[PDB]
Each structure stands twice: as structure tokens, then as C-alpha cells.
């Protein structure tokens, strides 16, 4: 649901790297959820 | 897997001459001809330039890169190391403008690697940006190769300027904007009659 | 009543908030009008910022600027001069500078007038400076027109902060400088100091 | 000489640009002379 806000097309490598940062930083995930 | 994808864009004398996106487990090495790290060869300036004096000096800078400018991710840090003879100065700035207004952020070291980007404070600043800080965190690394950082001159005078964007950081700032964060200054003043 | 075949081709590159959003090359006998057909001049539509931007505050302000352009920013060649005129409500400031940097180091060169056209580029001194460049002046003549639309010219702020910045390059002048370089002219400063150990 | 000069223009972007260069060169023989001299 957060990756829907990734409007730019991207490589699988960039996407996995975003997902890894999100998974490692649940407080960043929470901040993205909160601004919705 | 723990690699980062880097978009590399090189400029010679204010002209874009090269762009490549590379996601290598060992990072990259910016080199001047054809060691760990993916070698990214900066092109001969005769492909894109016509000023013969600038071409000569760019060619000289590129011939002194040696093993190259190494850039890689390890943990929370981006690391950089200068493996040749060209002194290289770096700053984190904007996509289309190398100048931050506060000079360079450092010089790339030779004898050991040196940190050039800390993911930790980026994420802190990304979170406060989503909370209304009004300032998006910067992520575009710029390297001035073979010349001092352009403080008192337009950056377009510099022989070799290389922008390196970790694309996952670009994407994270875009996600914050899509979610509603804005960096537009409260002092913006439109001139419309 | 501008004579077809005396026009110039213009490469138009638009930037919103330091991001390139549009590029079009147009060679029209009546020049162009940058807009957001009755009027002379070829209409060049600057795109809605929703296509390329995501910052909603910036998008709102760019949209406001674009909605006030009216008949547009007109630009055309006549004789030795490029002429510009503001046909809408957004004050627009212009300068001649570099391909990838709008700042010239001496602020704007002027404001685009509304009631009558105004000259923004004189071919005469450009040719004088092109000739001295081939003779060893060491300075290439500039040809890239930049327009700051709806805000002051960015003197004490980075140009990437500005909502709407439009570069217009007369491509024949780009070509003439390149020809001087091919012929051997250089603008490399004699004080360049390499840092190589 | 006129086509000799125009052919140095590496990477011309359009035929309109090329004709506009030629027209400036024909209007300005002092500019043509400077290119020939260099």
C-alpha cells in the first residue's frame, strides 16, 4: 500500500532497496502511514 | 542485495556527457579508461565537446584517475575512496545544481575510505519532512574531480563534475511528496498583476 | 507580416522547481508564445505540473502561474533583434546565460514588457563577440535566454527554488559557437589550476 | 566555402537550424572571413 505512492517507474533493484530501508526502519513506515 | 543502485551523470564544462544506472554488489569505480567495484568509464571528451583546450584538460584529468573514484554502500554509510592522483571534492546538493551554498562537504580520501553519506540522519530528516518540517532531505552526491570545489565560480566552468544519485533515496523523497510533504517556502512571493 | 524563412528555430526547455518538465524545438515565422488560434506566434504549452511533479504545494503554485499566462510570453526574431512581450499577468524576468545554469552573475538583464515588445537579444554584438572569440578573446558569446516566470529573478536563492524557469536557445547561435570551437577557439581560463598529485 | 564551413557543424539538430546558420553567414561576410582565417 505504501509502494503505490511510488509513482515513478523504477528498476527491481531500486524497489528492493526501498523495501529494505522500509523494513529496517518501521518508524519511517509509521511516518508514511501517518501522513495518510 | 545490500548494494545500492546509483544513477551516475557526468558533466564536462557544464555539458552532460554521460549517464548510466548501475546496481553492483561491490559499488562502482569511476575510471578514465578501459580491483573490486564496477568500472564506469567516463567518456573521452572528443565524443561530446569541441573546445580543444577544455578537451585537452579533461583528457589530462581522466588520465590521472588511476584505479578510480570508488563509491559503495556498507551499512548506514556511503563510502568513497580516491584511488588515483586527482584530488576530488564532494558535496550533497540538488539534482540540477551542485552548489549547496556552503562549499564542499569534504575531500575524498586516498589512504582509507571515508564516509560521504549517512543514511541515519537522512531518515530522521525524511521523517520530519513528512511531519511538516518544510525541508526535503538532500541525496544527490556531487564530485568535483581534479579542481577545487566551485565556490567562487559557476559550476559549469569545472572540467569534470559527476553527480551520483542513490535512486532509492530519490524514491523515498518522492514517496514523502506523494504523501503530502511540501518544501515550498512560506515566503514565496508571486509577481502577478 | 513577419516574413517566413527569416524566423529562427528555438529550443524551449522548461523547468519547474529545478526539474526539467518539457522540451520542444519550434521554428515558426511568427516566433512562439509560451502559454499555459487568434494570436500570431506558435503556442508552446507548458505542461500541467501533475505530469512530472509530486510536491503538492509546488504543483499548486506552478498551476497558478500557468493559469495567469494569458496570451503567453511572446518571443520572435525581427532583423538584428529578438523581441519579447508579456501578454498575460505573470511578470517575467530574463537574462542571457549558460546552457545548464540561468545565473549569469549579474542578476536579470531585464523585465519582459507588456504594453510593447522589448529587445532581449541583439545579434550585432553577438557576432562581434563571436569574431573576437575566433581571434583569441577567450570568451565565448552567450546565447541561452532564460525566463523566470511569475517570481523575481533568483539572485540570492538557487535557481532550482523558482517555480517556472524556461530556457530558450536559438539553435543557430548554439551552432555558430560550436563552429568557432571546431575552428580552434577556446574559453578555458588561463588561471585553471588542476589539483593532481 | 559556405558548405565547407557548414559541414564543420558537427551534430546539426535540424535543416532549419542549418539554413539559419547559412543565412547569418551570407549576411555577415566578416564572420565568414573570421571562420576561414581561424
UniProtKB/Swiss-Prot annotation, chain A:
Q: Where is this protein found?
A: Cytoplasm; Nucleus
- Modification comment: Methylation of the KIX domain by CARM1 blocks association with CREB. This results in the blockade of CREB signaling, and in activation of apoptotic response.
Q: Which residues carry this modification: Phosphoserine?
A: 8, 11
Subunit and interaction comment:
Found in a complex containing NCOA2; NCOA3; IKKA; IKKB and IKBKG. Probably part of a complex with HIF1A and EP300. Interacts with GATA1; the interaction results in acetylation and enhancement of transcriptional activity of GATA1. Interacts with MAF and ZCCHC12. Interacts with DAXX; the interaction is dependent on CBP sumoylation and results in suppression of the transcriptional activity via recruitment of HDAC2 to DAXX. Interacts with phosphorylated CREB1. Interacts with CITED4 (C-terminal region). Interacts (via the TAZ-type 1 domain) with HIF1A. (Microbial infection) Interacts with HTLV-1 Tax, p30II and HBZ.
Task: Give the protein's function.
Answer: Acetylates histones, giving a specific tag for transcriptional activation. Mediates acetylation of histone H3 at 'Lys-18' and 'Lys-27' (H3K18ac and H3K27ac, respectively). Also acetylates non-histone proteins, like DDX21, FBL, IRF2, MAFG, NCOA3, POLR1E/PAF53 and FOXO1. Binds specifically to phosphorylated CREB and enhances its transcriptional activity toward cAMP-responsive genes. Acts as a coactivator of ALX1. Acts as a circadian transcriptional coactivator which enhances the activity of the circadian transcriptional activators: NPAS2-BMAL1 and CLOCK-BMAL1 heterodimers.
> What does the domain comment read?
The KIX domain mediates binding to HIV-1 Tat.
Q: Which disease is it linked to?
A: Chromosomal aberrations involving CREBBP may be a cause of acute myeloid leukemias. Translocation t(8;16)(p11;p13) with KAT6A; translocation t(11;16)(q23;p13.3) with KMT2A/MLL1; translocation t(10;16)(q22;p13) with KAT6B. KAT6A-CREBBP may induce leukemia by inhibiting RUNX1-mediated transcription.
Designated name of the protein: CREB-binding protein
Q: Which organism is it from?
A: Homo sapiens (Human)
Name of the gene encoding the protein in the UniProt record: CREBBP
Indicate the span of the full protein covered.
2069 to 2104 of 2442
UniProtKB/Swiss-Prot annotation, chain B:
What is the recorded phenotype of mutating residue 157 to R? Highly diminished ISGylation
Q: Hey, what tissues is this thing expressed in?
A: Expressed constitutively in a variety of tissues.
Provide the protein's localization: Cytoplasm; Nucleus; Mitochondrion
List Phosphothreonine occurrences by residue. Answer: 41, 50
- Cross-link Glycyl lysine isopeptide (Lys-Gly) (interchain with G-Cter in ISG15) lies at 157, 163
Q: Which residues carry this modification: Diphosphoserine?
A: 183
Renumbered to this chain, region (Mediates interaction with ZDHHC11) spans 1-193
Residue numbers spanned by region Interaction with HERC5 = 2-157
PTM summary: Constitutively phosphorylated on many Ser/Thr residues. Activated following phosphorylation by TBK1 and IKBKE. Innate adapter proteins, such as MAVS, STING1 or TICAM1, are first activated by viral RNA, cytosolic DNA, and bacterial lipopolysaccharide (LPS), respectively, leading to activation of the kinases TBK1 and IKBKE. These kinases then phosphorylate the adapter proteins on the pLxIS motif, leading to recruitment of IRF3, thereby licensing IRF3 for phosphorylation by TBK1.
Q: State how changing residue 193 to E affects the protein, per the record.
A: Phosphomimetic mutant; interacts with CREBBP
Q: At which residues is Phosphoserine found?
A: 182-183, 193
Disulfide bond sites: 64-86
Q: Which disease is it linked to?
A: Encephalopathy, acute, infection-induced, 7, herpes-specific: A rare complication of human herpesvirus 1 (HHV-1) infection, occurring in only a small minority of HHV-1 infected individuals. It is characterized by hemorrhagic necrosis of parts of the temporal and frontal lobes. Onset is over several days and involves fever, headache, seizures, stupor, and often coma, frequently with a fatal outcome.
Q: Which family does it belong to?
A: Belongs to the IRF family.
Q: How does it assemble?
A: Monomer. Homodimer; phosphorylation-induced. Interacts (when phosphorylated) with CREBBP. Interacts with MAVS (via phosphorylated pLxIS motif). Interacts with TICAM1 (via phosphorylated pLxIS motif). Interacts with STING1 (via phosphorylated pLxIS motif). Interacts with IKBKE and TBK1. Interacts with TICAM2. Interacts with RBCK1. Interacts with HERC5. Interacts with DDX3X (phosphorylated at 'Ser-102'); the interaction allows the phosphorylation and activation of IRF3 by IKBKE. Interacts with TRIM21 and ULK1, in the presence of TRIM21; this interaction leads to IRF3 degradation by autophagy. (Microbial infection) Interacts with rotavirus A NSP1 (via pLxIS motif); this interaction leads to the proteasome-dependent degradation of IRF3.
Query: Which named protein is this?
Result: Interferon regulatory factor 3
Query: Species name for this entry?
Result: Homo sapiens (Human)
- Describe which stretch of the whole protein the shown chain covers, with first residue, last residue and complete length: 199 to 396 of 427
Amino acid at each position: 500500500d505504501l509502494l503505490r505512492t511510488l509513482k515513478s517507474p523504477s528498476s527491481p533493484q531500486q524497489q528492493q532497496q526501498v523495501l529494505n530501508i522500509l523494513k529496517s526502519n518501521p518508524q519511517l513506515m509509521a511516518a508514511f502511514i501517518k501522513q495518510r | 542485495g545490500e548494494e545500492w543502485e546509483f544513477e551516475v551523470t557526468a558533466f564536462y564544462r557544464g555539458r552532460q556527457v554521460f549517464q548510466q544506472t548501475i546496481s553492483c554488489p561491490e559499488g562502482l569505480r569511476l575510471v578514465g579508461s578501459e580491483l573490486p567495484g564496477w568500472p564506469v568509464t567516463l567518456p573521452d571528451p572528443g565524443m561530446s565537446l569541441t573546445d580543444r583546450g577544455v578537451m585537452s584538460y579533461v583528457r589530462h584529468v581522466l588520465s590521472c584517475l588511476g584505479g578510480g573514484l570508488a563509491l559503495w554502500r556498507a551499512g548506514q554509510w556511503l563510502w568513497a575512496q580516491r584511488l588515483g592522483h586527482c584530488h576530488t571534492y564532494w558535496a550533497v546538493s540538488e539534482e540540477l545544481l551542485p552548489n549547496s551554498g556552503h562549499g564542499p562537504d569534504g575531500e575524498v580520501p586516498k589512504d582509507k575510505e571515508g564516509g560521504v553519506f549517512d543514511l541515519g540522519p537522512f531518515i530522521v530528516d525524511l521523517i520530519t519532512f513528512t511531519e511538516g518540517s518544510g525541508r526535503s532531505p538532500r541525496y544527490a552526491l556531487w564530485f568535483c574531480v581534479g579542481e577545487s570545489w566551485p565556490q567562487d565560480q559557476p559550476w559549469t566552468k569545472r572540467l569534470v563534475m559527476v553527480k551520483v544519485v542513490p535512486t532509492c533515496l530519490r524514491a523515498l523523497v518522492e514517496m514523502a511528496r506523494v504523501g503530502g510533504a511540501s518544501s515550498l517556502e512560506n515566503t514565496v512571493d508571486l509577481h502577478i498583476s
